[PDB]
């Protein structure tokens, strides 16, 4: 009664509406973000999907080789996957040209910046009159983007024992709601879940163990980790580079440990392809190994069709 070493169960799920993908270090967060997206889109033609990114560097645009902007366009070649790239740190900085009680209270800036996004989304669903059934979040690389989930409880911990010198205490109770109607949702294992991306080395298995804890605290659902850039060197057509085969040895060591540490988790092993994985034709080919787990023997070829 073990768990499936893949995300099939989630790409197949019909209940989820919110999916978060994250992971510090250059581990493959963006790539995985796109892969989980494409995979979900191809497996549920009826539903309509949105892949949104907060990153200023416009990664999704680089990933697909298309220029996605603040305007939810559709992926050239897809039919229900639409990407949207916005910057909330800049939009929330304009209608603020004070926040003094923001930097004072930990979590506001985030909750603020997030709702600023949610806004830009429902707006699209208006001008486009097209409802998105599920949205995938390419969580920002640095900073605790979704820490606002603590805002509610925290804000209580500073009201019964603490205090237009009161119009502040008014539009602040109006907030501990917008964020609680949400957190209520995000904290529902059937509607939203988080997927951690990590490379199989120590500094990363650590950073992600940390993350999984940060998420557990927020009472968000963490159930799957995708271990990216694996070698599986022994399974190449032949032994050449020794410095490589030495690394695999180490990765293998930690994989075993990850498996032991998270038995109830969906630990997804992804192979390291030769060179970039850019553009739909490849993102797709690579992404299918999130559904049917990659087999180094049989699938060995498919990781070489990629440029």
């Amino acid at each position: 009664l073990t768990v499936e070493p893949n995300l099939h169960s989630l790409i197949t799920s019909t209940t989820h509406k919110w999916i978060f993908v994250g992971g510090k270090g250059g581990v493959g967060k963006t790539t995985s973000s796109c892969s989980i997206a494409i995979q979900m889109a191809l497996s549920q033609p009826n539903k309509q999907f949105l892949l949104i990114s907060t990153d200023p560097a416009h990664n999704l645009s680089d990933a697909f080789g298309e220029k996605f902007g603040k305007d939810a366009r559709k992926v050239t070649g897809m039919n229900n996957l639409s990407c949207m790239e916005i910057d909330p740190s800049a939009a929330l900085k304009d209608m603020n040209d004070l926040a003094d009680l923001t930097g004072s209270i930990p979590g506001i800036d985030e909750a603020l910046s997030f709702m600023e996004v949610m806004k830009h989304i429902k707006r699209q669903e208006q001008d486009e009159g097209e409802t998105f059934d599920t949205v995938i979040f390419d969580t920002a690389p640095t900073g605790h983007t979704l820490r606002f989930l603590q805002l509610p409880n925290t804000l209580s911990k500073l009201l019964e024992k603490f205090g237009g010198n009161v119009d502040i205490s008014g539009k602040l109770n109006e907030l501990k709601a917008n964020v609680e109607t949400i957190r209520q949702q995000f904290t529902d294992p059937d509607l939203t879940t988080f997927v951690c991306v990590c490379i199989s080395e120590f500094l990363s298995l650590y950073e992600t163990e940390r993350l999984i804890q940060e998420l557990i605290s927020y009472d968000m659902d963490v159930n799957s980790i995708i271990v990216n850039q694996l070698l599986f060197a022994e399974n190449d057509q032949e032994h050449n580079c020794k410095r490589c085969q030495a690394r695999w040895k180490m990765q293998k060591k930690y994989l075993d440990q990850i498996d032991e540490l998270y038995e109830d988790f969906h630990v997804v092993k992804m192979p390291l392809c030769a060179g970039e994985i850019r553009g739909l034709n490849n993102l797709t080919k690579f992404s299918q190994f999130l559904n049917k787990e990659y087999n180094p023997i049989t699938d060995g070829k498919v990781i070489y069709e990629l440029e």
């Binding site: 200023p56 560097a57 910057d87 740190s89 800049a90 929330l92 900085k93 930097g103 800036d109 920002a140 640095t142 900073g143």
Partner: peptide
């Protein structure tokens, strides 16, 4: 803080 979240 808002400027830092604008660079890679």
């Amino acid at each position: 803080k808002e400027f830092n979240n604008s660079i890679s």
